[PDB]
């Protein structure tokens, strides 16, 4: 294996606090850091954690093609990889979600035979779900770039969530330091009118970028987006959320094949699990405390853990080593090079803890860290799921 | 305002490392922590950070309805909020992505007048994009729960990415500790055959849950999913990625209205920005170093920052306060209660720094931490970074 590595990481959206613990650890360990971030508090923070940082934003310029900038950013990173160094690239949000140069740099590095990896981060869509109080699972989610959405005539589903990025620069790919003049916005509004109608809601969303700010969560009708003083509020960090227009019915063949009925139970398509989506037009009130909810809450007084439940039963030495593997990239690289040698040098481990670390298998680690009861084995991964349509049928 | 708050946070997918700095700080600051996580190293880590934690997973049981469990989890959290405490709920991944009880608890607390907020985290879909080397923007992304996909007959787009969660428990909502018997998996395989054809690829994806493990990124044809040896590999943490079957063409009217028009250039739908999606069937090789790429690289030697570029120009004292507001929830609460009193007790700030913090305005803070040059008063101002696809392969 060749000297040199490229790891691309994210900052998240909200300054400093939305960075992951592993993103931070890689930035600290790197020989060289290259970054493109949105706010100066995040920039200042990065520079305190590594002595050899370069700002990629300086490679944009007025009238200079963005694709030429991306080629330059990628080549700067890959040049240091070719010299045998551990390089880290840092981008705003999740570094592979609506970003060009990260994918280019990683693919070049990988094809020339160097180690290459992207670490995930928190994206603007992750913030959207949290701030607007929606779940992509209910009733499904479509995500597009706004100019692509129009140019390639991408389909909408009126029964699912729709999220549109880059609504502030329709049809514009030029760079200018004073930013976008969005004079083809009306082409997007026309499309939304044809798909949803003039009175359907559109939510203007801007996630807070500093820890003290509130998010923008402003509902307008499609028609109001034609008003000049509303249209001008949409800029370079604006995203649209468009809620469903209707509820989709269930397919009788699938109901049969999945054996979800004894008779026609009357699970109406409009019947919902609390809470309902508050942006959806003409959505009725859902009762949070039904008779079945009240009865479930009554059982809490008598509750004990079930006999099959596995309590945590670990040690300081074992918790410390699992933490070190997640937060120290050098410790992890040593462990992966030689499981046994590494396991032997960790002090205070019991024989089981040492044996599980030597093997590295998930089940071995679970047994060393959790007490497994007789009743469970006689018949042990969690099995947590989201419930929607099935829980409201039978 | 009523005493008490609820903050729901995530742990991410890979044990410990994928937790956010703010998730950790809220767990440390809470009066009571309630958690549901699926690996013991993450559980042990949480327990080292707060002395009053309760595992919510103990409220599942064999034959007991998952909805009744959800009602119970929600009520344990909100009972403590109603006592005036700062409560933190912790869920695997992103706490609002394919999760029931988080939304219920937050909605109840909000309607009754308490402070309520969800902090985003890293989901399994975030992991998927990073490990499979795809971008949702190119060529768009549809995400569904697998049983909902079948029952409500949700539409596919053959020209965009498709992501399906919960493919290991098609049609089944019961709880059992010994787990899912995935007997209706064939119903999903039939639908994928109808929509994509028997020889189209499906990627079986499992993100690494421990730091030393590799992800599962195994490509199969739809037809191969009918083989029992392959179907048995699909479990409770399995997600499917199905890549596009074809490239979608551009609309002439939109090209004309957006003025990307001059002469009719012949930018083909199959032509792509490097790199191409490696999972897509019959994807052509794309050249990383075209003549224009080489010309751009040659300009690197003569490069200087543009006149309008804004270098960072801040202080240790200002950087420390902005870091503290992000990592210390009590300091943030104090700052929000009264900007001016907080700003006046921070030592070593310059007059401009102190004034910007008194205002709280993002432009004022930016101007205090960056050298904004005279070539740049257009405001009466973020980076202006975008993704480029179709437009960059036209004009
Ligand atoms: C080039 S993309 C960068 C996306 C980033 N990598 C991420 O993880 O979200 C630019 C677009 O992201 C979205 N975006 C960026 N910041 C945002 C914010 N604070 N709130 C809402 N959307 C935002 C907007 O649609 C913007 O046009
Ligand atoms: C109830 S959901 C929870 C999702 C979680 N909140 C998140 O942010 O991704 C369970 C489903 O998430 C997906 N999932 C969970 N862990 C995963 C992993 N390690 N790799 C791939 N998919 C996973 C699977 O589709 C699984 O059936």
Residue numbers in the entry:
A (entry chain B): 7 to 385, 397 to 411
B (entry chain A): 7 to 382, 384 to 387, 397 to 411
Copy text verbatim from the article accompanying this structure deposition.
While chemical methylation of an amide bond uses a strong base to generate the imidate, OphA, the precursor protein of the fungal peptide macrocycle omphalotin A, self-hypermethylates amides at pH 7 using S-adenosyl methionine (SAM) as cofactor. Omphalotin A derives from the C terminus of the OphA protein, and it is the OphA protein that methylates its own C terminus using S-adenosyl methionine (SAM). The structure of OphA reveals a complex catenane-like arrangement in which the peptide substrate is clamped with its amide nitrogen aligned for nucleophilic attack on the methyl group of SAM. Here, we report the structure of the peptide amide methyltransferase OphA including complexes with cofactor [SAM and S-adenosyl homocysteine (SAH)], cofactor analog, substrate, and product.
Y76F and Y98A led to highly aggregated protein, and only a small amount could be purified for analysis; very little folded material was obtained for Y98F, but no methylation was detected. Y76F, R72A, R72K, and Y98A were unmethylated even after 3 days of overexpression in E. coli. During prolonged (12 days) incubation, there was some evidence for a very small amount of methylation in the Y98A mutant (>100-fold reduced in vitro activity), but not in the Y76F mutant. A different conformation of Tyr98 is seen in inactive mutant complexes (Y76F-SAM, Y76F-SAH, and R72A-SAH). Y66F retains activity, and Tyr76, although within 4 Å of the carbonyl, has a Bürgi-Dunitz (44°) angle incompatible with attack, so both possibilities were discarded. Both Tyr66 and Tyr76 are, however, well positioned to stabilize the resulting tetrahedral carbon by hydrogen bonding. We therefore hypothesize that, by disrupting anchoring interactions, the flipped conformation can be adopted to relieve the steric clashes between SAM and the amide that would otherwise occur. We speculate that the flipped conformation of the substrate (seen in R72A, Y98A, and Y76F SAM complex structures) resembles an intermediate arrangement that occurs during translocation.
